[PDB]
């Protein structure tokens, strides 16, 4: 019921316009509303579940006014293994047809007013704090 | 780039050997045809007329909008000396180079020639049969071996004493091999007419003691003629240049009588696609050529794996591009052979993409982009991951008596340029190895 509700929130309610789905939410939820997606992890090199996530966006309501295009963005650390599984587990969307397009920089990042994990004091708290994460009568008595 | 090449190595030559280079009219009516438009109209008025015309009567003619090409004409005949400057009476005369007037005067009018253009011995061959099929078999070994293609038939040590010898095709015992440079892919990238005067113009400054002349007397004498036809048999030096010349498949010889090919009329002036491919997301390459040298050029950045008749099928990646960068070839080189040999259908699709853009937002130009970005994107990535490592020779330099001298010698690699990075907490920096015994000259002085 919990998700059931948050999924109709998430359609319907104007002020909560995104959520945090997870592996659950992976396949056979119907999203009309959904137009945007990201990814921050990933089932190692499974190429299924890069297609059906962005399978919740495929099917936008507003999918025919002019010049509307949904987005699928994918957050990978550089210099990581997560290079070697993700340029695997989209291996079946190239086939189908669709490209990825590599995004070293986001334009107008440092102007955000607040980003999190600014101060390196903040970045060292969270290091460690991830690294860290490894007689019946008697009845009165009591 | 072709005009100005030819006309480009014709001014560095001094100006005494510019005066005999003009007695044969064979090498004048060639010329001639390589000045600006401007330039060919002032000299045609001159050559019918024995006087002199001052300056202020050519700037008459052009007209105020035209008045800057009247700058790069002016200019372009003076560095080649054929029209001489003599001023007298107060007033900067202009006049035309005699031996260079008589010559063309002789060419247009039928005059005395001394056979510059040659003799006919009307003994014909056929052009489609032979003179195609031996120039182009014999251009095509040269390209093919500078390719780095396998092949059966090697060319003769001439040429490939003039290849190595230029920048085309470094080599080295050591690797004993021979492998295309940043230049060389940029050669095979010119059209035939400039790939053949790269050749050519490297074999004149590569001749030593033969005279530069008799060498241009004949690549500009060897324009006139026409093929498919003969011409009897000069010079001493024209007969061993005669034969160099036929191993670069420019003349064609049975074994007396020389015939010139389609290139040789090629050098003079100008004149589905063959070579056109298709990539697609998948960095996929399909080629619509039947030819082994653009198979062999594909090779280079391009991991073949099947072939027909009529087109080449392959794919892009990281192993190839990286073997081909590794050879110095620039991946902004690759992207123009890739978009310069686009098939029609990715340039149709790409006007639409562009057509689209336009309809929604005319405000905004795109540009015209015929393939896909994301493969221009992860070639110069890859090429971003050769350039991952940034190591220098050199020298650091430390432990210093005072903050002065510090500044002082650090300062002094600035000036120079040789230096390469420094802190001034440590009161240390780096300088080149190319400047390391400058600044030792001048930290003792
Ligand atoms: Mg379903």
Same mark, same amino acid.
């Given at each position: 019921?919990?998700?059931?509700?948050?999924?109709?929130?998430?359609?319907?309610?104007?002020?909560?316009?995104?959520?945090?789905?997870?592996?659950?939410?992976?396949?056979?939820?119907?999203?009309?509303?959904?137009?945007?997606?990201?990814?921050?992890?990933?089932?190692?090199?499974?190429?299924?579940?890069?297609?059906?996530?962005?399978?919740?966006?495929?099917?936008?309501?507003?999918?025919?006014?002019?010049?509307?295009?949904?987005?699928? !963005?994918?957050?990978?650390?550089?210099?990581?293994?997560?290079?070697?599984?993700?340029?695997?587990?989209?291996?079946?969307?190239?086939?189908?047809?669709?490209?990825?397009?590599?995004?070293?920089?986001?334009?107008?990042?440092?102007?955000?007013?607040?980003?999190? !994990?600014?101060?390196?004091?903040?970045?060292?708290?969270?290091?460690?704090?991830?690294?860290?994460?490894?007689?019946?009568?008697?009845?009165?008595?009591? | 780039?072709?005009?100005?090449?030819?006309?480009?190595?014709?001014?560095?030559?001094?100006?005494?050997?510019?005066?005999?280079?003009?007695?044969?009219?064979?090498?004048?009516?060639?010329?001639?045809?390589?000045?600006? @438009?401007?330039?060919?109209?002032?000299?045609?008025?001159?050559?019918?007329?024995?006087?002199?015309?001052?300056?202020?009567?050519?700037?008459?003619?052009?007209?105020?909008?035209?008045?800057?090409?009247?700058?790069?004409?002016?200019?372009?005949?003076?560095?080649?000396?054929?029209?001489? @400057?003599?001023?007298?009476?107060?007033?900067?005369?202009?006049?035309?180079?005699?031996?260079?007037?008589?010559?063309?005067?002789?060419?247009?009018?039928?005059?005395?020639?001394?056979?510059?253009?040659? %003799?006919?011995?009307?003994?014909?061959?056929?052009?489609?049969?032979?003179?195609?099929?031996?120039?182009?078999?014999?251009?095509?070994?040269?390209?093919?071996?500078?390719?780095?293609? @396998?092949?059966?038939?090697?060319?003769?040590?001439?040429?490939?004493?003039?290849?190595?010898?230029?920048?085309?095709?470094?080599?080295?015992?050591?690797?004993?091999?021979?492998?295309?440079?940043?230049?060389?892919?940029?050669?095979?990238?010119?059209?035939?007419?400039?790939?053949?005067?790269?050749?050519?113009?490297?074999?004149?400054?590569?001749?030593?003691?033969?005279?530069?002349?008799?060498?241009?007397?004949?690549?500009?004498?060897?324009?006139?003629?026409?093929?498919?036809?003969?011409?009897?048999?000069?010079?001493?030096?024209?007969?061993?240049?005669?034969?160099?010349?036929?191993?670069?498949?420019?003349?064609?010889?049975?074994?007396?009588?020389?015939?010139?090919?389609?290139?040789?009329?090629?050098?003079?002036?100008?004149?589905?696609?063959?070579?056109?491919?298709?990539?697609?997301?998948?960095?996929?390459?399909?080629?619509?050529?039947?030819?082994?040298?653009?198979?062999?050029?594909?090779?280079?950045?391009?991991?073949?794996?099947?072939?027909?008749?009529?087109?080449?099928?392959?794919?892009?990646?990281?192993?190839?591009?990286?073997?081909?960068?590794?050879?110095?070839?620039?991946?902004?080189?690759?992207?123009?052979?890739?978009?310069?040999?686009?098939? @029609?259908?990715?340039?149709?699709?790409?006007?639409?993409?562009?057509?689209?853009?336009?309809?929604?937002?005319?405000?905004?130009?795109?540009?015209?982009?015929?393939?896909?970005?994301?493969? %221009?994107?992860?070639?110069?990535?890859?090429?971003?991951?050769?350039?991952?490592?940034?190591?220098?020779?050199?020298?650091?330099?430390?432990?210093?008596?005072?903050?002065?001298?510090?500044?002082?010698?650090?300062?002094?690699?600035?000036?120079?340029?040789?230096?390469?990075?420094?802190?001034?907490?440590?009161?240390?920096?780096?300088?080149?190895?190319?400047?390391?015994?400058?600044?030792?000259?001048?930290?003792?002085?």
């Amino acid at each position: 019921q919990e998700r059931m509700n948050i999924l109709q929130n998430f359609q319907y309610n104007d002020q909560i316009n995104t959520i945090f789905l997870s592996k659950v939410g992976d396949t056979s939820i119907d999203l009309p509303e959904a137009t945007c997606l990201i990814q921050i992890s990933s089932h190692y090199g499974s190429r299924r579940q890069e297609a059906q996530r962005l399978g919740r966006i495929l099917r936008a309501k507003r999918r025919n006014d002019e010049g509307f295009n949904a987005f699928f !963005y994918s957050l990978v650390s550089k210099d990581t293994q997560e290079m070697y599984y993700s340029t695997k587990r989209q291996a079946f969307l190239v086939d189908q047809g669709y490209a990825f397009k590599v995004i070293t920089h986001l334009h107008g990042m440092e102007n955000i007013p607040n980003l999190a !994990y600014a101060s390196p004091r903040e970045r060292r708290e969270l290091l460690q704090e991830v690294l860290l994460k490894n007689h019946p009568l008697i009845r009165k008595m009591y | 780039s072709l005009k100005h090449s030819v006309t480009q190595y014709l001014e560095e030559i001094p100006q005494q050997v510019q005066n005999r280079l003009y007695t044969s009219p064979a090498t004048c009516l060639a010329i001639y045809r390589i000045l600006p @438009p401007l330039a060919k109209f002032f000299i045609m008025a001159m050559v019918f007329n024995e006087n002199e015309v001052p300056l202020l009567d050519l700037d008459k003619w052009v007209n105020s909008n035209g008045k800057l090409q009247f700058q790069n004409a002016i200019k372009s005949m003076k560095s080649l000396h054929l029209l001489i @400057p003599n001023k007298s009476s107060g007033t900067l005369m202009i006049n035309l180079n005699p031996t260079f007037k008589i010559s063309l005067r002789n060419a247009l009018t039928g005059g005395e020639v001394q056979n510059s253009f040659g %003799v006919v011995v009307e003994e014909n061959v056929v052009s489609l049969d032979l003179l195609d099929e031996y120039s182009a078999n014999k251009w095509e070994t040269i390209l093919h071996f500078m390719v780095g293609t @396998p092949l059966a038939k090697i060319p003769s040590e001439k040429v490939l004493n003039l290849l190595k010898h230029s920048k085309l095709m470094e080599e080295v015992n050591s690797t004993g091999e021979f492998k295309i440079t940043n230049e060389g892919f940029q050669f095979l990238l010119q059209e035939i007419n400039s790939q053949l005067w790269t050749l050519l113009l490297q074999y004149l400054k590569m001749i030593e003691t033969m005279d530069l002349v008799d060498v241009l007397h004949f690549i500009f004498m060897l324009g006139a003629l026409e093929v498919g036809k003969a011409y009897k048999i000069l010079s001493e030096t024209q007969r061993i240049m005669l034969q160099d010349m036929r191993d670069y498949g420019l003349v064609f010889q049975k074994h007396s009588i020389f015939y010139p090919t389609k290139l040789a009329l090629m050098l003079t002036s100008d004149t589905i696609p063959d070579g056109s491919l298709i990539v697609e997301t998948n960095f996929k390459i399909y080629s619509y050529s039947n030819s082994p040298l653009q198979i062999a050029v594909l090779s280079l950045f391009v991991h073949l794996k099947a072939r027909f008749v009529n087109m080449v099928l392959g794919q892009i990646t990281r192993e190839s591009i990286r073997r081909a960068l590794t050879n110095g070839i620039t991946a902004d080189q690759i992207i123009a052979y890739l978009e310069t040999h686009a098939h @029609p259908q990715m340039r149709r699709l790409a006007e639409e993409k562009l057509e689209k853009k336009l309809e929604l937002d005319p405000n905004c130009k795109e540009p015209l982009q015929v393939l896909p970005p994301t493969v %221009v994107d992860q070639i110069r990535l890859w090429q971003l991951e050769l350039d991952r490592v940034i190591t220098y020779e050199g020298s650091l330099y430390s432990d210093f008596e005072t903050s002065q001298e510090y500044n002082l010698l650090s300062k002094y690699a600035q000036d120079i340029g040789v230096l390469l990075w420094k802190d001034d907490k440590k009161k240390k920096f780096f300088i080149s190895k190319e400047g390391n015994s400058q600044v030792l000259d001048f930290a003792k002085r």
